Symmetry: C2
């Protein structure tokens, strides 16, 4: 009286809706999506994972898709949208086989067999790149892969030297690793995004405000001042008793002698070492505040005074400059002074930034992203953080893979002809391998669809070119050119993808998409 | 003032085609299902013929209208494959509809079919097998006749109709160039006896026979003589009667009615004395299309002369060919050469109707297929199986080429067309996308036969491909086909499953143009009112 429930037709269709959304924004020809919270928050981001965190989906099928990208950002850091396109399209290709009566286990097991065979073809297709530091010229084209995706390509040439020189400056040449936490990103509005420049040192928030402070100081010594220069009180509890206002200044000056005594010891250090020597300077950090009386004292000696510094930024100044933190003025020593180059302070009424740049061994970098609007700050920041992590796996892993659908078209061609020659799996496995082979061709068709060129013509020109290369007995890599619409050589164009990015993308999208077909029924319980 | 376009049709046309496809999908093959269709007539009829299904149902959907016209053209030419073509048109639209979302233009889809159709004719000429016109092929004709019979019945009736259908064509058709005529084979319908007891009739049978208790049951070697004169009393055009009040007036008034009767009757009984008087084991039979008077009933009983009355005019014209005797309008001009020749003549005894067997003739040059059944729907199904069997064998004698069935032609053609364009690469890069849809659409037939039987269509597909791979390495020729009973592959030459060449030749070309025209309509046009 009861037979099964057929099930399905709910998870595949719900996953098809998420694919159509993320199909348009994939690649450098994609689109920039905008989300609205309703409280006044507006964010424009082309990344898939960043958008899924701000979107609530009731369908549990798309929930695991967002959770599948959690391991991609923490490891690969790039290609979150590409993984989603491989999960959705694989379900559409398998949908036709399910209606024919094919059991999903063979469909699931057929994907794992093709996944292990893809790893063998993955090691043959990859190219080993040397660890020499002369590859920076080659790293310029590699950095463009992440940049051209998130922007309109007008700011790519500006951000190309900034992202490239940020990692290589803090990285000595050895195996080691690279740490992107040492690169701080700050933002200031009321300026154009084309003014973005590279900062070698650290940018400080609160700048010195005074007309007589020197703007440019070359070869100045950095000194960390931990004592408070603000108003001080007597070490014992007392009070100010004055009959007239003239008597109050006498009692107030008694407590000011404690600060004035420390200021006389600081100014003596400047004239002691290279006081009258040209091209010399003395700069006081002074994390704590500054009283209004010391502004005129430091102005006569052309000393840069700063106050209200963040505790986190002070830890980097000790590494960049080298000067130790001096708690007491009586214990101040000439060896505490550090080293710095030309320091120029940009004058702006809203904010004033102090440049710590031009140091011998800074071991730090700063990427300053400035834009007038709100979306200009978030869009560029998404491209830099994705650009630093894309190059991160390039220097760590010696293997590099060409992009623009080079590996996707090649692997789909290899797995097609290899299944007929081997025939060691099973006769019913062909349905799982053919579905996986056709699911890899959606990425080159997705990139060209956003450009407007016919995806049918670009598919035929690449397949006809690969067949002519085998008869010529040589190795020639072919890729999809989005600008012209024909094929291209990915080695000459400069489109390259990291090995660790595509390794977890194919493996990750295979295991998550296979688990979706394994669901027999959706149960609602707990309420 | 916008250039945005719509589909609105192809998605509905394929959906309407998939609905009609599933109706005839389970109705195809010997293992298919038999569906009942009754529209307004209260008459139960069960048949698997695809053409009869569409004519008995009124479909408002415009998609099934063109499909209905495709079955009418295949019956008037090929006479078979009505359901197979419908299954090919519907499945081809499914593979073509998936490429529409990709952006494939329907003209290249139609152009890709013409390229694959011309290439299919090259493989069609190599795969076909020429059959000899020799009359020793009756053993091979038994295997071909069962292929058409097993489809429309439960397979229990096939063994009964196997000798009947095979001997029906060979008996009426002498072996020469000539031609064959299926209209010369009579068809009689009877609802009395069960269909398991049906038999073949070599001669001609008639409806109304003579009824007398003393008529002989069996008459061997009887002479057939056509008699056009009335042996029954006749009356004036105006109603009148002869009433006698005395015994003397009885013979006076009755003599006027028997004057024409006695003149012809006395001359007929003289023929029995001069001809066939002494000769034993012979008989004499009178046709007598008109009625019979009660006076001649006693005369025919003493001489054991079989009497007949109320004969069909169309049947008497064929009696001149079977028996050989010419129609005699006047007994005065009757000659001894007018008497024909017939074999054993015996009449079955049934209360409602009676039969007459002219069978066992030297040169009958005619046949009669007697259809028996208990119910009404059993007669309609059996009549459909006989008419489909005669037209299937009709193309066997006309066309010397024969093709094996059971998916042997479709699997080999779908595999050949896929590997032919990859090696040659002489068509186009974009066109081969639509060509693959035509190759995958030819594998639905072997998957449909195993679907009704409950077998895995993917399992039987991989088993055939494994056998074809071993056949490509060796230089010999070995054909592979799907076995529905066992579930594994089979040799179609040993099993005996064969399909006509003319039916399958117009099936590929016919289904190509019908399925292509459905893809050429972008927008449905509603006008005229």
């Amino acid at each position: 009286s009861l037979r099964r429930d057929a099930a399905l037709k709910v998870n595949v269709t719900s996953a098809e809706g998420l694919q159509s959304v993320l199909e348009t924004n994939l690649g450098p020809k994609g689109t920039l999506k905008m989300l609205v919270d309703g409280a006044g928050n507006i964010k424009l981001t082309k990344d898939g994972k960043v958008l899924l965190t701000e979107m609530q989906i009731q369908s549990p099928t798309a929930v695991l898709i967002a959770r599948a990208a959690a391991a991609q950002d923490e490891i690969t850091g790039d290609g979150t949208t590409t993984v989603v396109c491989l999960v959705g399209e694989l379900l559409r290709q398998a949908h036709r086989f399910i209606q024919e009566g094919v059991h999903p286990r063979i469909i699931t097991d057929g994907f794992e067999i093709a996944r292990k065979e893809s790893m063998k073809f993955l090691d043959e297709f990859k190219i080993s790149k040397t660890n020499l530091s002369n590859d920076r010229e080659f790293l310029l084209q590699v950095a463009r892969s992440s940049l051209l995706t998130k922007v309109d390509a007008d700011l790519t040439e500006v951000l190309t030297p900034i992202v490239t020189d940020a990692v290589l400056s803090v990285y000595d040449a050895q195996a080691d690793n690279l740490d992107l936490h040492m690169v701080e990103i700050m933002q200031m509005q009321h300026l154009s995004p084309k003014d973005t420049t590279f900062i070698k040192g650290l940018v400080l928030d609160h700048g010195g405000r005074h007309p007589d402070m020197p703007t440019r100081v070359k070869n100045a010594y950095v000194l960390i001042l931990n004592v408070s220069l603000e108003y001080e009180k007597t070490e014992v509890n007392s009070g100010f008793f004055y009959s007239s206002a003239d008597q109050r200044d006498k009692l107030a000056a008694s407590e000011r002698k404690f600060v004035d005594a420390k200021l006389k010891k600081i100014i003596d250090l400047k004239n002691e070492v290279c006081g009258m020597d040209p091209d010399k300077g003395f700069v006081i950090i002074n994390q704590k505040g500054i009283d209004p009386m010391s502004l005129d004292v430091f102005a006569k000696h052309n000393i840069l005074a700063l106050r209200r510094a963040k505790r986190r930024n002070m830890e980097r100044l000790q590494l960049v400059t080298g000067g130790e933190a001096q708690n007491s003025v009586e214990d101040l020593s000439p060896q505490i002074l550090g080293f710095s180059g030309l320091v120029y302070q940009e004058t702006i009424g809203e904010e004033k930034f102090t440049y710590v740049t031009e140091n011998t061994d800074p071991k730090s970098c700063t990427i300053l992203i400035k834009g007038s609007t709100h979306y200009a700050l978030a869009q560029t920041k998404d491209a830099v953080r994705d650009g630093l992590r894309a190059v991160a796996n390039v220097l760590k892993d010696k293997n590099i893979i060409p992009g623009a659908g080079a590996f996707y078209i090649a692997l789909s061609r290899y797995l097609r002809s290899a299944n007929m020659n081997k025939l060691g799996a099973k006769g019913k496995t062909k349905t799982g391998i053919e579905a996986f082979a056709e699911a890899l061709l959606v990425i080159p068709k997705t990139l060209v669809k956003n450009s407007g060129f016919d995806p049918l013509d670009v598919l035929a020109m690449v397949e006809d070119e690969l067949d002519d290369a085998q008869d010529s007995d040589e190795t020639r890599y072919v890729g999809v050119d989005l600008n012209i619409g024909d094929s291209c050589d990915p080695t000459i164009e400069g489109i390259w993808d990291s090995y660790r990015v595509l390794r977890n993308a194919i493996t990750g999208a295979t295991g998550i998409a296979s688990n979706l077909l394994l669901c027999d029924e959706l149960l609602r319980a707990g309420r």
